[PDB]
Structures are given as C-alpha cells and as structure tokens.
C-alpha cells in the first residue's frame, strides 16, 4: 500500500520533495495525499494513509480520493451527486 519515492536531494541529513521543500531526517510530514513520507537518505519512503471505505455497491457505486480535503468518498456510480453505503473502512 506504499512505494519509495527516489530523493532528488544531495543532503544526508535532508531529502527534498517534487516541491523543492525539504524535511529533516527521520522526521514524518505529511503532504496534500494526507500520506506519510519519511526521509531516509535516497529514498523517501511514502505511504497512503486515507481511509479504504468498503461494503458499496461495486456495481453500482465507485471508490473516488478527494484531493481537496484528502478523504475517501463513495458515490453512485449512476448518481455522481449522492452517496453509496460503507460497512466500515480500512487502513
């Protein structure tokens, strides 16, 4: 449910983002995708945090990342402007 991300920073101590901003290492931020991303030294390894919904109608519901508040939301495939049902997520 994770992948490394190939640091494009020449510092030890710091790796350096798509953005150009860098974090100190062994720290833990999070970024717009609310994942976690720790610095390593070559490699930042990142992960997705937000929270899998489960039990909808497959097929008759769809599973879509909101980037604007970084949250999972299900909602009728045939109906984009209401939602499905949830069982219960998973992380």
Request: charged share 25%.
């Amino acid at each position: 449910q994770c992948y490394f991300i190939p640091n494009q920073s020449l510092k030890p101590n710091e790796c350096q983002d798509l953005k150009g901003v860098s974090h100190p290492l062994n720290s833990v931020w999070k970024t717009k995708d609310c994942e976690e991303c720790t610095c390593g030294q070559d490699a930042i390894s990142c992960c997705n945090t937000a929270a899998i919904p489960t039990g909808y109608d497959t097929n008759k519901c769809q599973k879509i990342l909101n980037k604007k508040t970084c949250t999972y939301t299900v909602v009728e495939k045939k109906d984009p402007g209401k939602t499905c049902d949830v069982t219960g997520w998973v992380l």
